[PDB]
Structures are given as C-alpha cells and as structure tokens.
Amino acid sequence: PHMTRKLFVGGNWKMNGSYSHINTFFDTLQKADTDPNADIVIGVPACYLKYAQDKAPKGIKIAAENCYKVGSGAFTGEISTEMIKDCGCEWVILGHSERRHIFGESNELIGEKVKHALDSGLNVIPCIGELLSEREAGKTNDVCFAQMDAIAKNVPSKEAWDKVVIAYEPVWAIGTGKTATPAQAQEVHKVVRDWIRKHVDAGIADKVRILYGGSVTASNAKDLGTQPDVDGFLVGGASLKPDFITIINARR
Amino acid sequence: PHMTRKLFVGGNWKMNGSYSHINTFFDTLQKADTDPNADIVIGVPACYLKYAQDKAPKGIKIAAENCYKVGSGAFTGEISTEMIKDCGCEWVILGHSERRHIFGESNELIGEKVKHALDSGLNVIPCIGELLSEREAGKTNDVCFAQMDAIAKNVPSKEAWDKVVIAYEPVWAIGTGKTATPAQAQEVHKVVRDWIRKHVDAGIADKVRILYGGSVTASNAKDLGTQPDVDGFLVGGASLKPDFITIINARR
Ligand code: NA
Ligand code: NA
C-alpha cells in the first residue's frame, strides 16, 4: 500500500517542555518497544535542542520547530541552520500552521527557508494545509497547491527530496479534536502526491513521505496510517504523552 | 549626573553564536577586569541559554532574545517565560526593532509580552525607537511615546519597574555605523524620562535605567555614557567582540 515508503512518525512539542519532562519522557521512550522500521523525529523548543538529542534513545532524531532563512546575522529571536547543527540536530519543521496563521510567515518566506535549510544540509518537514474557511470555499486543493509550489520550487535538486518529508495538517484539525477522517486524509494526500508527480517528478512522488497531522491520537492513528498515500503522522498534543508510543506502533 | 542609577551594559548576539564562541568569549570575559559596579546582561540565541549562563562569569546574566505572551501551549517556534527560567535565566529582551520591523510584532503584542514576563518573575529590557522615515517626519517623540504607553500600561505595579530596563535604539543606528551623537541620545532619553515622570511616577522615572543602543562601539561609548539621562548601553555587533569589555569599562 505504501510501496517502498518507510513509516515516519513526527512529534511537535510546540511551546511545551522542560528538562524534567525531557528526562521522564525519554526514559519511558527508551524502555518502550518501538517499531524498529519507523523513522521518529520530535520537534522541541530551541533551548532544549542539544539536551534532548543527547537524551533521546538511539534512532530518535530531534527537530527544531523553526529556523530563519540565512546563516547568521541581525535577526533577534531567530534560530539559524548552523545553530541547529551545532546542537547536534539534523531536522527542522518549516511552515507550521501556527507560524503561518499566528505569526504571519508567508509562502515566500517558507520557501526561502526550505531552500536555505536544504542548502545547509538539514532535513526538512515542510507543512501545508487549509483553513476551515478555505475548505468551505472549495479551495482545499488550491491552497495546498500554492503551498507545495513554494516548497517544491525551493528544493534545490532531485537528490534533495531525499531530505524532505511533507506534512499535511488541515488547520481545523490542529488541536481541535476534529481529526480528518481516513477518507478526508487519503483524498488530500493522493491529490498532493499527484501534484508532485505532475509538477516535480514521478520517481520522487513515489518515494516522498507525506504525513497526516491534526489531532492524531493513539486510537485513530491506525486507520489513518493504513491509507496508501498517508506515510505517517505529525503529532502535536499526543507527542507529549506516552500515547506517542502507541502511535509509533500503529503500522506494526 | 546619573543620580543613584547604576550602570547597565546589555549585549545582544542576535542570530550569532556557537558553543565554541561561547567558550572562547567567556574565557576572555572571565580573565578581563570589568567594572564591578556595572550590571551586565547578554542576550544569546535560545538554544544556548543554559550553557551560556553556566559558562558566564559570576555577576554576568544571560538574557533570552524574545519570548511569547503565555506560559505554554500550541505556539510552534516560540520560547516561554517558564523555559527561560528552566534554563537558569532571568532576563528577556522584548520589542527589539528587528522583531517589530522584520517580524511584525505590534505594540499591543509587545505590551502583552511585558506584562506576562513581569508576571512570570522575569526582568525585561523593552526596546523603543523610531525609523529614519519617522524622524524625518518629525515623529520621533510620538513614536517613542506610543511604544512607552504600551510598555508602561503593562508594568503590573510600581515595584515591577525594579525589573524593567528601557532601551532606546533609533532604528537608523542599528547595525549601520550611524550612531546617534551624544546630543541626539541625550535629547530622546530626557524626553522619555520626562514621559515616565508625567505618565507613571516621578520616583520611578528617577530610578529607571534607560540604555542607548545603535552602533555603540569601544570608541564612542564613553561620551554617550556620560550623558545624564543615558544609563548604559544595548550593544549588538560589538558584544560579539572583545570590544564589549571596553564598552563595559566606559564609565569607569
Ligand atoms: Na542520544
Ligand atoms: Na555561571
């Protein structure tokens, strides 16, 4: 169903976390039996990048939740690609709905960040997804296509897609409990994969992981994950809880 | 000239720094003879907060370069007041010109952040200052007054002003080499101090430190610092260099 696409389970702690929580959470994670064929990446606040990557069990990668679009400079409050690598980390989440819709990051800025992160040797999780008002207007695909256009035109090469994991999160499902049904997720992922097939490359479309995110839980992950164009999850609230282990083991 | 107001020397590394630079810089800082009657606070990228505060010599405080306006939650890419304290830090720079004019943070948002930081037990360095276009339009005081209004109405009590250090940085002086003259800095600081005297309290106006920032260097700091309403500096580019030591020792 998912061809040669390996399961990917992302977490995003958003603006939560502490040294105490990191110690406990990753002790539980190390003790637990997790699917050895899942890629696991957890986004954490920037002040915890190195500590959490040191404390993470082998195989688990830590992501920055954002970064800026140049290597260094006069950008108070920003985190650079080089600081992420200095902290021992290789992943960054880009274009999350909260950056776009609370902090006003544009498609152009997120595209610029995708290119700079890829050109710095980072792996990226670019986020796409539509507002409730956009879906009601019949613009779900239009919005996702414009977001994918900005991302895709900024992936510097065909090889670079090996370092890209797309996450689709309908904004109305993020933090609301109103999870997309397996049908709703599959429909959008198929449309996005077809877009990548047509506008980028058919080989790459077949290989690129596309995550569903937006109120993924331990009980709903299995049915979302068995959809053929859903390759895994980007988990918010539940990635702070032991439930994240169950979600990791959903395709097991 | 500066009454009972103690010298305050702030640094802002902006989007620069690394574990290697922190080690070297703070070895030089520990070895150097710094004015023992100066408060010294250095803003660093969030991924380095704990490390830099552990490595800083005694007496030197580390600041976050930004924070959000609530304690925790679904705010991808944000740093909270509680994470700053978890990293052993007590200071945050708020409303820096780069946040206002590159990342679109409004007066209302910066006011909300001042109140939340103060209500979390943090010390704050709220930043004010006018664009070149605003000074040419004759609006320098107007802009500073509106920014001070948002800050002042969000300082929860009279005691809380003990945890506030205002920094005035004309945007045209930040990173440009076009330092405000001692005259230009003194004129604005006097106007701002008078504003605090009239709109807040005369006691507080007498005690609150007001920093000048914007292309402060080792050679120009002395004359800026001897101005009676200039209580110290907020230093950008030069706080990455050994010159920061000379600036710290300018009022010596
Ligand atoms: Na580790
Ligand atoms: Na220390």
Author numbering:
A (entry chain A), B (entry chain A): -1 to 250
Provide excerpts from the study:
Helminth parasites are causal agents of diseases prevalent in humans. or TIM-barrel fold composed of 8 alternate β-strand and α-helices. three invariable catalytic residues (Lys, His, and Glu). enzymatic activity, leading to the concept that TPIs are obligated dimers.
helminths, we solved the crystal structures of TPIs from T. 2-PGA at 2.1 and 2.3 Å, respectively. in the presence of 2-PGA (TsTPI and SmTPI) and in its absence (OvTPI). measured the melting point of TsTPI and SmTPI. and TsTPI exhibit a Tm of 75 and 57 ºC, respectively. illustrates the positions of residues TsTPI-S213 and SmTPI-S215. the middle of the SXD/E insert, whereas TsTPI harbors a lysine. stabilize the SXD/E insert in SmTPI and TsTPI. TsTPI and SmTPI harbor 6 cysteine residues in their primary sequence.
